[PDB]
Ligand binder design. Structure first.
Ligand code: HDE
Ligand code: HDE
Ligand code: HDD
Ligand code: H2S
Ligand code: H2S
Ligand code: H2S
Lengths: 726, 726, 308, 83
């Protein structure tokens, strides 16, 4: 036996906090979690304990350490079929990655609606508050490869596969409510522009290069989503703390045949929260897997990601009631004008077993709708419909990609399609065509109806010539960017300014920078001048005099557009670094952890080495990581207990830990002598808002620190950070 | 659009004679026929009755007759996802056909040994007379595409997949005991030479063209398997009536570690039988699916194909005891020298459900062996071990071909291989490598041993330098062709002469024909002269003086090489045409059918139109096919009962039917006034051996006819057929 | 015309130091750098200036900004073959990445011997100092995907394709003189152990995880190459400042048929140099393209990578 | 895409146009053409927007669809005129 005698190789099969155990496949970690889709994948799960090692043909292998050779120092023989089978399978492991959104992280869960929505849609999964629908959700970036970093600045994808009793519905959304372009014909142009440039395949996971900003400067329609990307929306703290949106107007269709326009929303119940750019960028270095790791560890802890589905609903007769076109995917519908109606809750509660099989192979596509839903003429959605089926023929090897286990419906599926590469289903129908008499015409068409009926498209009126032409109604580019900008807090605005300024600084051809500055002067002069100043560019007198664009339906802001204007903080599942010394005051640490536990906040105990240290009173404290090993980038706040402060007082890494956390606007708490660290971050003796301090770690010390955590970051600190060399 | 009220669209799920019912998928025809493999496919069998028609995503379809368009005479819309899925699946149905053996027909069955073979092999499937091993067998031609004809002149493949408890064993053999070439390196040269020529891709299914004869004339090693192909072995009557062979010397390994050399045989329990060339060739046009159809209908009728597995066993110390090299696959082992020992019986008793999913995607490969079996250094076998795994990567789309249902072992398989395109198995093992401690090293290696052990290669001694060199012991090319020739009956020899003469006559470059005749002069002067004569070639004096090759270890002939020299007829499963008239003598038909039924011989009732005729006693006789629709090619014998013979006496098709049957040496029986047809085929009043005649069809008349059928064809008639214009 | 008046969109076709010009495809940057291989590629190079935008079938496109629709706010039509061809090609751009060494950066060059080696090998490309052999060299990491970071701690690959007059010779080496394992049958075990773990596909570009160290602790043959990886060998400054090795004993064979055992080396004429760990790790976040960028820009500058 | 292995089937020699073909499409399996264009998107300034769209005209013009009038509802319906 190679496993240790004490069984410490095997993670506890129960919820445990991040870092407490090694992570495990989902069905081993949480065998008791189930849903209809997880149960149906059982026929393909393969175990391993107590089984013999075999070839793929079921032949037991005796020696899996050597090739067959003619003498022990001789040549390898062609008749070694065990070697070639094993090396062949390895040689062909990889499949093409996704053209876009290649990097992503996925989990199983379930959805349930709060009440029946049968008055507005006949979609079965929304018909009964008792109906529970398994889901599989993949979150992603957009630009980088499957091996790129998580905490890049980019749009994020948010795709949900609903396994409904009337078919798969895939809601394939992003973490912003619009897109860069209006018509799908330009998708390869915009994507090529943002992707690594074609001569040298640089840069990875970044829009900060010439071709991106060239395209933007030439295509003002892009400005609305570029504003979102340049804001902190572009660098979420966690997939659990970003919004999701369905991007387009779709339709709900009720049993009476009435159509209502809809835009889809996901509200994060853990609240909205993003990193700051210096932190996000350094974190792509320190842990390029941070979001994938965070999601997996949240689920293993029982901090299940939760989202509320919501609908913006517009009656058909209100199609033309706004200053913008409902079909224009560069326009958002402000919540001040059309509120989000809550629809149901989704909980992600189980990790996959095998990332390749379940995550890499999963295929989501927004054309996968069910009776009760329908499309509109949004010309970006229209062309999406072609792409998501097509692309699977190479990516997943052919047209039987719905037979890959994760992609399988739980609903019945029967039809007359046959063959193709990989074919799993063995059809026994005497007929492979309809109409047929030889199988009494089964499987049979089903008329549409209120439930369990066939799909019929809503009979929308179509009138016009065959044209390749953009609707004039789409030809307004600045008003939405302006509403977004005006809706942001002052510190959010500063981070937008800094996003543009940093990205344009990496554009080598200056004229491209100048051109983008001109576009910003069409949105807001303050923004434009602020960027210009950071680039050494001076606005012309004409630029100074560009009339700002109109407000959007009388609105001069909408607070729902800001990450932070309206507090929605949640501390459960956040993490604190605790900086240990070689004689910690135990009474501080008891008080710290008691208060963290009661709010579901995690801790990591850090020191200058691994192993353990011992508190003032004999308590043995195990160390999770070194200061260098688990940098402040990875935590939401830092607490330093009292004790032998001299131990770490001249430790470069320990000082720098507080400096980095300070720069990134994180709450910091110092008890007793740990107040000696106030010198390293230049804090005055009377103290400052965002630095919690006291003789000991209670009465109200932990409450103060937890209040600061609920507000995410200490925005007031921004004017002090430039002075700090970190 | 539905089934007839009378239920006549659906075949009875009971054994029925050929033509009595429409044919059907195996699981619907014979639902009670099971074996472990057939059952294990139930996870993927898909029914159809009572199910709604859906997309692959499980969405019910309301209208499967129309595309979505803007107005009912308008353009089709890109949002029609139902159309695009349906069309996309169709557009990608085809996969690459097999490089060789693309044309093939398959069925399920089972194998069991007669007695334990544990003294000579530890192979589990040969260890116990009561352990039943499921099989899937595919029979094939070699050269032609998957849509080429069955009754071509060609070698046939005979591949058997044994789903044993210790893994898949594939015995991938052919219907002759040798191959054309000695070293695998030459396989692409030989296969290119026999395949359609590269400029124009002609001819299909035929070696009768310049490149094949060019290669043969230049590579005398090919002459043995050429002799077999030119004989009637090249044109079997049925896959049920040909022998199978394993082609190479393999090894059996017993529990004690003792190696025995083995060559594998399959003996057809229905006996050995072939077509004649004019019949075979004409039948590729009248029914290019004849062998496929006959196999399927034999299984539906209960005439299950049965084969006896047999081994030629040579002790290790006897490796060098013959005058040929055991490892040379152009040499056969004569049964006079090494008898075939009967080992067990294989029964094919169920057709597949879906030809594509089970037949076309099946992957057989002779490197798929199990403990108790091993290879030899046969240099043809050696290179086959590389090819059968390699070719699957394009043909079946990747390294997960074992997960295609037909290919899956019934034995457990577990190992550390992961990913690849269309990966089905979801591995839960925390480890994907070994040695590992994190899963206590499971799944684990298994030492070799008497039963259920890991595979270990027999420790054959290897001594030699790294050389590309043919063994000098392989450099003899004429003695086996000659042994084969001398072992054939005089009529078999005439058919071989005619096959070479026909084929060479289609070689356009005359020097190639000449060079082949020179090769023939090195085998046998009589054969060489007879072919020369048909080609208008005169042998030179030198050619006339070529010393015949030596006998093979003292043998002048070996009758086991002949199809017919030793009687082994079995009429069960054969078929007779009965030519009706509009007033059949019912008493003749009663005795005819009763006698045929007693011996398991089928009948097809033929007439000059379809529908019914009524017999003299009122019996209504449904007509299977017209004289033209089911020609004498497709049957084994023809009977013409009495009655209103004037109805058909002057029918050109009825007359030709007898001329064709007569020319092709088939038994013919004529009752009462049907004796008038004697004039069409010029039988004298006295009668002729091979024509049964009498006032009525009685005991004596049917016994005689059945005795002739047990002898397959009427070879004595050959002198008389030159003259018939048919 | 969208280009600026002053022509400043186009980099000078002359050697320029890093950051002085935008980088460019090599035949536009250095049109007059030639070798037999670069010249033979001319049949497939495709330009662009002054040519009409077309489908792949040669049909000129009038409007590359819109899909065909029934009215300017209507549904997209299935007969828009221009849109579908364009989106089809896009949807199928990606091919599987290499199983290992997926991350790599490559350049064209040439090789020339110092003297005839006919006394020890009949290899034609080593037969005369006048024999100029074009090469294409690809440097790589090992573990991470094609979109992973350059300055990870990993072994590096150093693969050279020699286009000789008697065939392609590929010298497929790494930047340490040994490997982790002894027998090819274990390669998928070792590679699975170092690669991201299979439940959750973490970590990228790193051996710093349980399964790798598990395998190493159970397979002491690995320890030699593990020493190299854990040294600063595992974090080179530059592909220009690392060594290469052919990893195995091969043979040279001469005209007389005499065999000599050989191990191959590449000695970097720019000398040996590596990063420090803190710096390499932070650099994976500040510029995950650092070594790819540095190689391209060294070449653009005339600082050609040279190895003996 | 399955029959000929990918989206570059126009580069298979028999399939190639003899007319010029230039555009911003890139990559795919079996890619033969080595594009030197600094740009792989349009609109672009870095290659002066080449290759460029061409207005329709009497000869050598870009493709424009005939502006056929469409009018009706989104239906899966056979025209009665086809019955
Ligand atoms: C609205 C949310 C959104 C929008 C507006 C778009 N993407 Fe996505 N995308 C593909 C193509 C595509 C096109 C043609 C357009 C507009 C014309 C969009 N995108 C905009 C794709 C190439 O077909 C794609 C690649 C892999 C795949 O299966 O489809 C694709 C991916 C994708 C994902 C990833 C789903 C997953 O596996 O996690 C998400 C969330 C989006 N797109 C969102 C999206
Ligand atoms: C010592 C130099 C070296 C050694 C000893 C090995 N690798 Fe490499 N490798 C492949 C497989 C493979 C095996 C089976 C073994 C030992 C048995 C080695 N490696 C050790 C491969 C999967 O076939 C590979 C992946 C793509 C490919 O075409 O081959 C492969 C890649 C690779 C490269 C990259 C060359 C390139 O594409 O740029 C390099 C430099 C090595 N290996 C070095 C190498
Ligand atoms: C080294 C090349 C090579 C050689 C020398 C042979 N084969 Fe083979 N054979 C192949 C390479 C191959 C193949 C290319 O791998 C095929 C077609 C694709 C397939 O899966 O295997 C195949 C198919 C194939 C099949 C069809 C199995 C099926 O039904 O799918 C049979 C019966 C044989 N072979 C029989 C033979 C016999 C009796 C041979 C003489 C010993 C022989 N093969 C030599
Ligand atoms: S969107
Ligand atoms: S053979
Ligand atoms: S190596």
């Amino acid at each position: 036996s190679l496993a240790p005698e004490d069984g410490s190789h095997r993670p506890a099969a129960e919820p445990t906090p991040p870092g407490a155990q090694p992570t495990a496949p989902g069905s081993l970690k949480a065998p008791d979690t189930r849903n209809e889709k997880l149960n149906s994948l059982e026929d393909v799960r393969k175990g391993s304990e107590n089984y013999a090692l075999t070839t793929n043909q079921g032949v037991r292998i005796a020696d899996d350490q050597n090739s067959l050779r003619a003498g022990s120092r001789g040549p390898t023989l062609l008749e070694d079929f065990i070697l070639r089978e094993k090396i062949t399978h390895f040689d062909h492991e990889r499949i093409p990655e996704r053209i876009v959104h290649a990097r992503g992280s996925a989990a199983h869960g379930y959805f349930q609606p709060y009440k029946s929505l049968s008055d507005i849609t006949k979609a079965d999964f929304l018909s009964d508050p008792n109906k529970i629908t398994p889901v599989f959700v993949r979150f992603s970036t957009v630009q980088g490869g499957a091996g790129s970093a998580d905490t890049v600045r980019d749009i994020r994808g948010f795709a949900t596969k609903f396994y409904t009793e009337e078919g798969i519905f895939d809601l394939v959304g992003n973490n912003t409510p619009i897109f860069f372009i209006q018509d799908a014909h330009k998708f390869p142009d915009f994507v090529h522009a943002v992707k690594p440039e074609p001569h040298w395949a640089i840069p990875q996971g970044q829009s900060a290069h010439d071709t991106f900003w060239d395209y933007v400067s030439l295509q003002p329609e892009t400005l609305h989503n570029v504003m979102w990307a340049m804001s902190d929306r572009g660098i979420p703290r966690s997939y659990r703390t970003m919004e999701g949106f369905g991007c387009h107007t779709f339709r709900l269709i009720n049993a009476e045949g009435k159509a209502t326009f809809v835009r889809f929303h996901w509200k994060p119940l853990a609240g909205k929260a993003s990193l700051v750019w210096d932190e996000a960028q350094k974190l792509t270095g320190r842990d390029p897997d941070f979001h994938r790791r965070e999601l997996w560890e949240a689920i293993e802890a029982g901090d299940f990601p939760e989202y509320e589905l919501g609908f913006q609903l517009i009656p058909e007769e209100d199609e033309f009631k706004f200053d913008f076109d409902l079909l224009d995917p560069t326009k958002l519908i402000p919540e001040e004008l059309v509120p989000v109606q809550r629809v149901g809750k989704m909980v992600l509660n189980r990790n996959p077993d095998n990332f390749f099989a379940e995550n890499e192979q999963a295929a989501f596509h927004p054309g996968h709708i069910v009776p009760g839903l329908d499309f509109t003429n949004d010309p970006l959605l229209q062309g999406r419909l072609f792409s998501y089926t097509d692309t699977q023929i190479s990516r997943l090897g052919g047209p039987n990609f719905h037979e890959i286990p994760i992609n399988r419906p739980t609903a019945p599926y029967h039809n007359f399609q046959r063959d193709g590469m990989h074919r799993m289903g063995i059809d026994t129908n005497p007929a492979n065509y309809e109409p047929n008499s030889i199988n009494d015409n089964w499987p049979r068409e089903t008329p549409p109806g209120p439930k369990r009926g066939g799909f019929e498209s809503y009979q929308e009126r179509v009138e016009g010539n065959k044209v390749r032409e953009r609707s004039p109604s789409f030809g307004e580019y600045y008003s939405h960017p302006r509403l977004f900008w005006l809706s942001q807090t002052p510190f959010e605005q500063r981070h937008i300014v800094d996003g543009f300024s940093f990205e344009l600084s990496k554009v080598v051809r200056p004229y491209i920078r100048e051109r983008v500055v001109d576009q910003l002067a069409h949105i807001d002069l303050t923004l434009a001048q602020a960027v210009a100043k950071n680039l050494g560019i001076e606005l012309t007198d004409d630029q100074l005099n560009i009339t700002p664009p109109p407000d959007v339906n009388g609105l001069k802001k909408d607070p729902s557009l800001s990450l932070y204007a309206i507090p929605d903080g949640d501390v459960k599942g956040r993490v604190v670094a605790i900086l240990l010394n070689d004689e910690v005051r135990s009474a501080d640490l008891l008080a710290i952890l008691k208060a963290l536990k009661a709010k579901g906040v995690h801790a990591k105990l850090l020191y200058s080495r691994m192993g353990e240290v011992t508190a003032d009173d004999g308590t043995v404290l195990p160390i999770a990581a070194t200061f260098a090993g688990a940098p402040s980038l990875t935590v939401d706040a830092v607490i330093v207990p009292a004790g032998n402060i001299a131990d770490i007082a001249d430790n470069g890494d320990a000082n720098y830990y507080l400096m980095e956390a300070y720069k990134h606007l994180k709450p910091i708490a110092l008890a007793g002598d740990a107040r000696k660290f106030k010198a390293t971050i230049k804090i005055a003796d009377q103290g400052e808002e965002g630095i919690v301090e006291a003789d000991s770690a209670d009465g109200s010390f932990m409450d103060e620190l937890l209040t600061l955590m609920a507000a995410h970051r200490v925005w007031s600190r921004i004017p002090k950070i430039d002075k700090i060399p970190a």
